[PDB]
Design an enzyme around this catalytic site. Structure first.
Site, PDB file in Angstrom:
ATOM      1  N   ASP A 168       7.353  10.962   8.197  1.00 34.18           N
ATOM      2  CA  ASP A 168       7.421   9.696   7.473  1.00 34.18           C
ATOM      3  C   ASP A 168       8.706   9.528   6.685  1.00 34.18           C
ATOM      4  O   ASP A 168       9.324  10.508   6.265  1.00 34.18           O
ATOM      5  CB  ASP A 168       6.222   9.566   6.528  1.00 34.18           C
ATOM      6  N   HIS A 305       1.899   0.625  14.720  1.00 33.40           N
ATOM      7  CA  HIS A 305       2.196   0.586  13.286  1.00 33.40           C
ATOM      8  C   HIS A 305       3.605   0.107  12.919  1.00 33.40           C
ATOM      9  O   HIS A 305       3.771  -0.934  12.276  1.00 33.40           O
ATOM     10  CB  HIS A 305       1.961   1.959  12.649  1.00 33.40           C
TER      11      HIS A 305
HETATM   12  C1  HEM Z   1      -2.416   6.311   5.453  1.00 33.38           C
HETATM   13  C2  HEM Z   1      -1.275   5.272   5.377  1.00 33.38           C
HETATM   14  C3  HEM Z   1      -0.053   5.266   6.231  1.00 33.38           C
HETATM   15  C4  HEM Z   1       0.598   6.210   6.961  1.00 33.38           C
HETATM   16  C5  HEM Z   1       0.176   7.483   7.623  1.00 33.38           C
HETATM   17  C6  HEM Z   1       1.834   5.551   7.339  1.00 33.38           C
HETATM   18  C7  HEM Z   1       3.164   5.624   7.712  1.00 33.38           C
HETATM   19  C8  HEM Z   1       4.108   5.667   8.718  1.00 33.38           C
HETATM   20  C9  HEM Z   1       4.922   6.496   9.596  1.00 33.38           C
HETATM   21  C10 HEM Z   1       4.320   7.854   9.759  1.00 33.38           C
HETATM   22  C11 HEM Z   1       6.085   5.799   9.743  1.00 33.38           C
HETATM   23  C12 HEM Z   1       7.251   6.287  10.583  1.00 33.38           C
HETATM   24  C13 HEM Z   1       8.642   6.267   9.893  1.00 33.38           C
HETATM   25  C14 HEM Z   1       9.572   5.208   9.717  1.00 33.38           C
HETATM   26  O1  HEM Z   1       9.842   4.376  10.700  1.00 33.38           O
HETATM   27  O2  HEM Z   1       9.728   5.610   8.537  1.00 33.38           O
HETATM   28  C15 HEM Z   1       5.958   4.586   8.970  1.00 33.38           C
HETATM   29  C16 HEM Z   1       6.486   3.309   8.816  1.00 33.38           C
HETATM   30  C17 HEM Z   1       6.520   2.050   8.194  1.00 33.38           C
HETATM   31  N1  HEM Z   1       5.325   1.800   7.591  1.00 33.38           N
HETATM   32 FE1  HEM Z   1       3.650   2.996   7.356  1.00 33.38          FE
HETATM   33  N2  HEM Z   1       1.967   4.260   6.877  1.00 33.38           N
HETATM   34  C18 HEM Z   1       0.775   4.070   6.172  1.00 33.38           C
HETATM   35  C19 HEM Z   1       0.864   2.785   5.660  1.00 33.38           C
HETATM   36  C20 HEM Z   1       1.475   1.582   5.462  1.00 33.38           C
HETATM   37  C21 HEM Z   1       1.124   0.350   4.785  1.00 33.38           C
HETATM   38  C22 HEM Z   1      -0.179   0.126   4.059  1.00 33.38           C
HETATM   39  C23 HEM Z   1       2.223  -0.378   5.054  1.00 33.38           C
HETATM   40  C24 HEM Z   1       2.446  -1.856   4.755  1.00 33.38           C
HETATM   41  C25 HEM Z   1       1.456  -3.029   4.484  1.00 33.38           C
HETATM   42  C26 HEM Z   1       3.166   0.376   5.841  1.00 33.38           C
HETATM   43  C27 HEM Z   1       4.479   0.193   6.240  1.00 33.38           C
HETATM   44  C28 HEM Z   1       5.617   0.644   6.899  1.00 33.38           C
HETATM   45  C29 HEM Z   1       7.009   0.311   7.169  1.00 33.38           C
HETATM   46  C30 HEM Z   1       7.564  -0.961   6.608  1.00 33.38           C
HETATM   47  C31 HEM Z   1       7.666   1.157   7.991  1.00 33.38           C
HETATM   48  C32 HEM Z   1       8.958   1.245   8.745  1.00 33.38           C
HETATM   49  C33 HEM Z   1       9.125   0.209   9.942  1.00 33.38           C
HETATM   50  C34 HEM Z   1      10.461   0.223  10.396  1.00 33.38           C
HETATM   51  O3  HEM Z   1      11.456  -0.114   9.684  1.00 33.38           O
HETATM   52  O4  HEM Z   1      10.576   0.620  11.607  1.00 33.38           O
HETATM   53  N3  HEM Z   1       2.714   1.644   6.121  1.00 33.38           N
HETATM   54  N4  HEM Z   1       4.740   4.500   8.334  1.00 33.38           N
END
Ligand code: HEM
Length: 439
Positions: A168, A305
């Site tokens: 992450d 996601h």
């Molecule tokens: C148990 C909760 C969650 C986990 C396991 C998880 C997270 C993950 C993983 C593992 C990545 C990959 C890394 C990256 O592109 O940094 C990422 C990306 C992202 N996540 Fe999550 N997340 C959760 C929740 C959320 C929530 C609730 C939101 C928004 C309403 C969100 C928003 C985002 C954003 C904005 C990015 C990067 C997209 C991009 O620029 O490509 N995440 N997340």
């Protein structure tokens, strides 16, 4: 537009990136007493961006940032309209809109008694306890810590990975206004998308809110054993590259749900197999935009996601408006034998989610409501995207496109991410903490 890095609370713009982190939630008991303590506490503990990017040699043993809830500003007599539409009523009052199961929220979040939060980032828990005491000492009983959520990076090679096992913190917007390296594929936005009052902020803010930012905090509990069990019981049969075994198919499924392999390798670049080296390379692991998988889901699902939270090309081209900074951290112990060997969660583990944006409704809330929860988003695609498998809360939680071969196949995924509480906070500029709050 040269941003004043010495006056901006570091975590908003640079991220503490420390192994351990503690969130100390509190309510204000005596306003006068509190502001006075504030005047001496800030200059002594509130760490800025400037401090986070400077050499270790002169950094505190622990970083501290401070945010206030609307009821907190109210308790402190600060009644200005900050200009955000959600901040005023609190997150719990907004939880239903997010699609939350209110029965799952726990005190002291199930209301607005929380007045503010202290973010303490350090490398060791004992330092966390040291600064925690410093807080309830400088302030004494002028405040009451009502709850403390602590988190820490996962062990060994897992450091940096959240509990489902995925790396992450890879993709983050880059804001103009300060000397900084931009990774290929990284979004570059006006400082106003993140810092209130700055260029790009469409909201109407009082002058003291300059260089502030809204934090959406979500306390998430993750059902890891259930997650694995589910991917095995649904392993994808095969893909261009060939037939996948049980593990292979399961791993591939998980990756199809996130948009990235547990290593960080984005599937839009490593569509049929993991590329560890690519994942670990910040110069390459984010150089993609789905422009090659717009009208089909071969390389990446429409509802993965990362694609739902940042659709990139799925919306025409660059768009500043919906980017946000994240500074989350995992919490809880690893998954045991009795756990995975049963597919049933037996311990509390999850993510202490932190997202910063000048406008709550255009960042976290938007990604959540308008995209993740919208089955018809991304818009106008040959196959219906569905509900984002990881955090989408619209029911039925049905997502399509996971199997690259027979894309039309859909999957109704069980929710593995569970909201236990959250709140919306505002972090003023370091100067505002004394010139306005403590004033
Ligand atoms: C148990 C909760 C969650 C986990 C396991 C998880 C997270 C993950 C993983 C593992 C990545 C990959 C890394 C990256 O592109 O940094 C990422 C990306 C992202 N996540 Fe999550 N997340 C959760 C929740 C959320 C929530 C609730 C939101 C928004 C309403 C969100 C928003 C985002 C954003 C904005 C990015 C990067 C997209 C991009 O620029 O490509 N995440 N997340």
């Amino acid at each position: 537009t040269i941003l004043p890095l010495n006056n901006i609370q570091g975590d908003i713009l640079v991220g503490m990136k420390k192994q351990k982190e503690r969130f100390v939630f509190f309510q204000v008991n005596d306003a006068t007493s509190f502001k006075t303590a504030l005047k001496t506490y800030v200059p002594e503990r509130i760490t800025s961006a400037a401090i986070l990017i400077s050499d270790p040699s002169q950094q505190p043993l622990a970083f501290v940032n401070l945010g206030f809830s609307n009821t907190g500003l109210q308790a402190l007599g600060i009644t200005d309209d900050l200009g955000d539409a959600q901040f005023p009523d609190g997150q719990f009052a907004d939880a239903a809109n997010l699609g939350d199961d209110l029965s799952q929220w726990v005190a002291p979040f199930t209301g607005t008694t929380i007045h503010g939060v202290f973010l303490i980032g350090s490398d060791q828990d004992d330092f966390l306890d040291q600064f925690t005491d410093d807080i309830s000492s400088t302030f004494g009983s002028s405040i009451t810590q009502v709850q403390a959520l602590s988190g820490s990076a996962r062990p060994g090679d897992q450091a940096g990975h959240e509990h489902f096992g995925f790396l992450d913190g890879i993709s983050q917007p880059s804001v103009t206004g300060w000397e900084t390296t931009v990774f290929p594929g990284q979004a570059v936005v006006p400082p106003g998308i993140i810092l209130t009052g700055r260029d790009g902020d469409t909201g109407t803010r009082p002058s003291w809110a300059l260089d502030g930012s809204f934090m959406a905090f979500r306390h998430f509990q993750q059902k890891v054993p259930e997650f694995n069990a589910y991917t095995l019981a649904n392993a994808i049969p095969a893909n261009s590259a060939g037939n996948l075994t049980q593990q292979e198919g399961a791993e591939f499924l998980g990756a199809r749900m996130f948009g990235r392999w547990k290593s960080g390798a984005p599937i839009d670049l490593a569509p049929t197999a993991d590329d560890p080296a690519l994942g670990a390379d910040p110069q390459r692991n984010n150089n993609f935009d789905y422009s090659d998988t717009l009208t089909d889901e071969t390389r990446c699902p429409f509802g993965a996601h990362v694609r739902k939270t940042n659709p990139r090309q799925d919306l025409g081209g660059p768009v500043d408006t919906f980017h946000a900074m994240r500074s989350s951290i995992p919490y809880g112990p690893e998954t045991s034998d009795a756990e995975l060997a049963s597919g049933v969660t037996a311990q509390d583990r999850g993510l202490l989610f932190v997202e910063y944006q000048s406008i709550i409704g255009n960042g976290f809330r938007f990604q959540q409501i308008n995209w993740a929860n919208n089955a018809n988003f991304p818009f106008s695609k040959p196959i219906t995207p569905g509900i984002e498998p990881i955090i989408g809360q619209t029911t039925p939680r049905t997502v399509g496109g996971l199997d690259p071969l027979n894309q039309n196949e859909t999957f109704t995924v069980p929710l593995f991410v569970i909201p236990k509480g959250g709140e919306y906070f505002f972090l003023p500029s370091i100067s505002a903490l004394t010139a306005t709050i403590a004033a």
